[PDB]
Amino acid sequence: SAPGGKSRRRRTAFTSEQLLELEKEFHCKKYLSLTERSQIAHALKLSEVQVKIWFQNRRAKWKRIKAGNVS
């Protein structure tokens, strides 16, 4: 896949807004808390699992960046 920004559509798994707010709060917090995740779910019409899974995917690649110069 080709990571980066992504906006418009409003008709697939995530919108502009959904994708924007997500890369926002994965910048500062490495892990959303219970309340933060629930809050973001209300705004973004997502659910705590969907938010967890997006954030988990973003967080995984970071592990092979941060310390992954072991190959």
UniProtKB/Swiss-Prot annotation:
Protein localization: Nucleus
Signal sequence, start to end: none
Chain residues forming the annotated DNA-binding region: 7-66
Protein name: Homeobox protein GBX-1
